[PDB]
């Protein structure tokens, strides 16, 4: 119906993308982040949602925009090393080695992208009542 | 540039002078220009210092450069180490690189030099020129599996009847 297009980088070279769909409309909270006003007009395309710039592994990171980038990278690398339920039929497959978490849990802090990655159905970790403190020094 | 200068009263006082930095190097002709101090002129190219002023000035410039690279990161290494490096680079007569083209072309033992970079060709040419090995190189006794004459093995232990 001509509502959405498929754009590669070469064609992306000659377009103007709006970051948010609210950047087409013509006192504030100090808490929120500082966002530069749209000084553009001739938009041809608009972004679906910026969070789509990430990959599958990076979409599991809570508030990745509040972290130093190499930390997001490290988490992206270590997420593939976490234990959980990799398949529902794990008890009928003869894999060389498979680890399945005893009691998986869907994280209290989720991403809207986690919905499509089936992470809340097949999680890889538990919510630990954590404490940041200096105790025994161990 | 700011600079500490001995005041006629005694104490060192900051006396700021004007110094000309330069992109481009040709020490052979710049120092002979009437107008500047021809005894304080310096280049970051120690290779030119070695050619123009001599091998000792080249040593000082080399140490200055290495020290500058080390201290550039705020670090600090004691003098004797860097000095040892620069000296072993400059004792041959010129600027001996720290590569297979530099010190590995020396007159040391065949095994020692063959234990680094080019191995087979070294053993070949050494086997062709009939070279004698002193076996007082560390890596050589390492190969031979002997107590190398280094540190604890730099001396011999014997007995003398004093009982």
């Amino acid at each position: 119906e001509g509502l959405v297009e498929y754009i590669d980088a070469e064609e992306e070279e000659s377009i103007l993308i709006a970051m948010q769909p609210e950047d087409l409309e013509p006192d504030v909270d100090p808490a929120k982040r500082i966002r530069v006003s749209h000084h553009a007009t001739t938009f041809t395309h608009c972004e679906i949602h910026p969070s789509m710039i990430l990959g599958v592994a990076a979409s599991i990171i809570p508030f990745p925009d509040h972290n130093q980038s190499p930390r997001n990278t490290y988490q992206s690398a270590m997420g593939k090393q976490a234990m959980g339920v990799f398949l529902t039929n794990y008890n009928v497959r003869m894999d060389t080695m498979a680890n399945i978490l005893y009691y998986p849990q869907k994280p209290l802090g989720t991403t809207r992208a986690m919905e499509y990655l089936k992470f809340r159905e097949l999680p890889a970790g538990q919510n630990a009542i954590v404490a940041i403190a200096c105790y025994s020094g161990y | 540039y700011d600079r500490k200068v001995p005041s006629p009263t005694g104490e060192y006082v900051k006396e700021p002078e004007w110094v000309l930095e330069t992109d481009g190097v040709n020490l052979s002709e710049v120092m002979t220009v009437p107008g500047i101090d021809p005894t304080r002129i310096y280049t970051n190219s120690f290779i030119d210092i070695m050619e123009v002023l001599g091998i000792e000035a080249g040593r000082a410039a080399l140490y200055k450069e290495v020290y500058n690279v080390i201290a550039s990161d705020g670090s600090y290494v004691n003098y004797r180490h860097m000095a040892l490096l620069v000296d072993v680079m400059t004792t041959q007569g010129g600027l001996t690189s720290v590569t297979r083209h530099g010190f590995n072309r020396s007159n040391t033992g065949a095994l020692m030099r063959c234990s680094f970079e080019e191995t087979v060709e070294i053993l070949f040419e050494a086997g062709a020129s009939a070279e004698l090995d002193d076996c007082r190189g560390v890596s050589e006794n390492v190969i031979l599996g002997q107590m190398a004459p280094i540190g604890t093995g730099a001396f011999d232990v014997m007995i003398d009847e004093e009982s």
Partner: protein
């Protein structure tokens, strides 16, 4: 002025005015000969090289020149008798202790300091408008015919 030197003198002095519990309101039982000739003879025992020929002796005095400068600067008659007011016993103790600590500070023969130097240079390099750091160090060690930033500093 601040430079790495073998024996620390300050700690020895402040240890001297603690070991003997000297009061700063009492005339020292020293002599001009005691201090002057004492230090002058102290400089004789700071042996780094132990040869008998002239060459080795010259190399010796050249090797102990700086530390002797520090020694004379710190153990001046005025400074000894007024700055901390040392006694005879305390002074002899200071001299002997300085000698001993100096003889301890000598490098031990057999010390593989080549590898030690190479490691002492290579290790901090891992923790790293002209070119500096690892590429510049690479240039220096390779003796680059063409350096990325040739500069001429003219005074």
């Amino acid at each position: 002025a601040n430079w790495p030197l073998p024996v620390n003198i300050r700690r020895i002095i402040q240890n001297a005015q603690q070991t003997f519990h000297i009061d700063h309101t009492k005339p020292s039982d020293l002599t001009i000969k005691d201090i002057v000739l004492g230090v002058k003879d102290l400089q004789e025992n700071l042996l780094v090289l132990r040869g008998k020929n002239e060459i080795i002796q010259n190399a010796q005095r050249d090797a102990v020149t700086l530390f002797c400068c520090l020694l004379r600067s710190r153990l001046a008659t005025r400074r000894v008798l007024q700055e901390y007011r040392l006694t005879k016993q305390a002074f002899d103790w200071v001299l002997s202790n300085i000698e001993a600590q100096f003889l301890r500070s000598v490098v031990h023969p057999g010390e593989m300091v080549g590898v030690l130097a190479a490691q002492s240079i290579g290790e901090p390099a891992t923790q790293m408008k002209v070119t500096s750091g690892v590429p510049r160090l690479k240039e220096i060690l390779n003796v680059a015919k063409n350096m990325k930033t040739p500069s001429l500093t003219v005074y």
